[PDB]
Write a structure and sequence with these properties.
Chain B: Homohexamer. Organized in a ring with a central cavity. The ATP-binding and proteolytic domains (AP-domain) form a hexameric chamber. Oligomerization is independent of its proteolytic activity and the autocatalytic maturation of its subunits. The structure is cut from a larger assembly and holds two copies of chain A. Chain A is α/β, with parallel strands linked by helices. Chain A contains 14 helices and seven strands. In chain A, helix 9 links the parallel strand 3 and strand 4. The relative contact order of chain A is 0.10. At the A-B interface, helix 3, helix 5, helix 9 and helix 10 of A face helix 1 and helix 10 of B.
Chain lengths: 359, 333
């Protein structure tokens, strides 16, 4: 039952001795009492971890670059970092799990780029959303004495990937509930995200340590003034600047319009949207740095186009140009009309920065 | 156990207890080192200038040389992040000819991880101190308590700080009295080492039992020495890059100190050197002469053209302005 896996995964020596002692204990145990049950659960958890199997590391720079570039446009820094990672891994023959954090305004694409990075690196992807924790139990687990004892989510992630050296995407670091007594997950993350302590994670449910030095931890936060200094010191932060209007237009025309059209039932059949319409929607409706509300606006426009196509059942193709844009996405809401045609004495125009952008 | 059968759970409880008792190194100790120069050498090949800690270890060896008993004190380290207050532990254990065990106390908030539970429970296990002793299979080990400040002072269902204070008692340490192993165990030989950042969090009764050594950060000159001696060769090795080619000049490291790294630790410096050599390796891969030069005049192409120099500074002081000094994390101001 348990022999084939432990044969095929090449487990380290210490865990091998622990497993041998465990089966020696089980040989003298019977199903009558709960000791056999807890021992069987312990052995199942021990065997679930992919102790000595990794993935096929990426070796081709161009194909990895093309995999990265087919889903995101402007993240030159992240793509360059991944290319450098691949280049370093090629010259050694081995890989090291570096810790990297992404910071930027919402909608820039911090969470979505993780799947593309994992696919380019040929690493199995697991996303761990940690915004709402108040206790360390989800990180370090619970001792097997307790009935409600489950390993930490890192061990469960390693089991789910069924292969060591995964990519673990930690979705929120800013939202981490610091609280007080009854638990502090921040120090648990310090233990997890230490560049030199990854070899001795030492989960509570599994007294044997596990190796995390190969895991490519990817974090994601919106601000940088909430994270404790010890946690921030062990993290390599990459800033994600918000997209420019021209960059937003290119992102739209290259990824959002085809995707929204494909998912609206009008895929490459009837409806197209002009560049002037995109520029107007950028200037008068979506002045932010992200591309979330722009995506919502495009999806609404294409949904209305699909409804019109269905109900109506002129011209061969329907145009959503700037002139008729207000009848699809409503009246403009970000018109700039508080200016002065001729500034009177005492008034001076200044500049400001907000989360939306320039003001 | 001689009058027990595998049918009932009494046999299982007794065999588990016997295995735990026989696994513990009740009487065997480690062989203490008596060579002060050898210990100094083996301490100086991993860290550059942590003079106070090295002197403390040398004094420990010297005082152990004058007796036969290897008394284990409670040394406690406090300093800014990235000063090597955790990486020293392994080298210290190697110098003391002891076995090293690390015990992270970052998120642990239950006394069951320190004292364990009674044998009455189905899956009771001893605390991490007894498990550390079992793993080392020797007395007087080096147990490194990795986080003293970040315990939370205990919430409900346990107060781990009080239990740790019970463990770290300089005088009444010979009777730890584990809850699972319900007889006293001699912890007076174990060497305990902290890893802490702020001294204002530890409770006074716990802080009074620990000998605190202040681990002040590194000066820029010490930073360049640490870089060129340990970080630049290691970062270069960690990306291939061996055979008589690209390296970082001394002026490049000086400019990195002056314009990029003004902290007290050497972690951001490690990041900058790692990214420099990472970009160098990427260039080497792309180009498949093999010599690349990195200096001051082309340093803001690898760690980023952005810098960290303003210096404030009026060219000439007008009447009314006075230049005082202020203390900051980034050196001074
Ligand atoms: N460069 C880009 N190319 C294509 N699509 C993009 C790009 N940047 C963002 N998007 C899209 O915009 C949306 C942003 O969602 P995503 O969760 O990735 O953002 P985020 O900044 O990580 O979010 P949050 O901070 O709320 O967690 C997604 O639909 C994503 O596909
Ligand atoms: N004085 C020093 N000489 C040589 N290397 C050092 C020195 N101080 C730190 N380092 C190196 O810096 C890196 C980080 O050190 P380490 O992880 O021990 O930090 P720390 O001070 O324990 O951190 P924290 O306070 O955040 O827990 C390691 O590679 C270590 O070898
Ligand atoms: Mg799509």
């Amino acid at each position: 039952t348990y022999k084939e896996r432990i044969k095929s995964l090449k487990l380290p020596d210490s865990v091998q001795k622990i497993f041998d002692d465990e089966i020696t204990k089980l040989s003298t145990l019977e199903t009558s009492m709960s000791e056999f049950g807890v021992i069987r659960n312990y052995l199942d958890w021990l065997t679930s971890i992919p102790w000595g199997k990794h993935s096929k590391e990426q070796y081709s720079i161009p194909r990895a670059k093309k995999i990265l570039d087919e889903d995101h446009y402007g993240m030159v820094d992240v793509k360059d970092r991944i290319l450098e990672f691949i280049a370093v891994g090629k010259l050694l023959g081995k890989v090291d799990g570096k810790i990297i954090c992404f910071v930027g305004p919402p909608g820039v694409g911090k969470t979505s780029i993780g799947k593309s990075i994992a696919r380019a690196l040929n690493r199995k992807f697991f996303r761990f959303s940690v915004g709402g924790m108040t206790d360390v139990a989800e990180i370090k687990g619970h001792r097997r004495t307790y009935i409600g004892a489950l390993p930490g989510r890192v061990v469960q992630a390693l089991k789910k990937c069924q292969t060591q050296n995964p990519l673990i995407l930690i979705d929120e670091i800013d939202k981490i509930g610091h609280g007080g007594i009854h638990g502090d997950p921040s120090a648990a993350l310090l233990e997890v995200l230490d560049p030199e302590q990854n070899n001795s994670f030492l989960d509570n449910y599994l007294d044997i340590p596990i190796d995390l030095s190969k895991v490519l931890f990817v974090c994601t936060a919106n601000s940088l003034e909430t994270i404790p200094r010890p946690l921030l010191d062990r993290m390599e932060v990459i800033e994600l600047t918000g997209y420019v209007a021209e960059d937003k237009v290119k992102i739209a025309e290259q990824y959002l319009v085809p995707s929204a059209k494909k998912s609206a039932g009008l895929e490459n059949s009837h409806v197209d949207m002009t560049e002037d319409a995109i520029t107007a929607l950028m200037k008068y409706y979506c002045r932010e740095s992200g591309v979330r509300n722009l995506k919502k606006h495009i999806e609404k426009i294409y949904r209305k186009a699909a409804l019109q196509v269905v109900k109506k059942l002129e011209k061969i193709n329907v145009s959503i140009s700037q002139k008729n844009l207000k009848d699809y996405v409503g009246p403009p809401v970000y018109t700039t009309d508080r200016l002065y045609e001729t500034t009177p004495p005492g008034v001076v125009m200044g500049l400001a920065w907000t989360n939306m952008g320039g003001c």
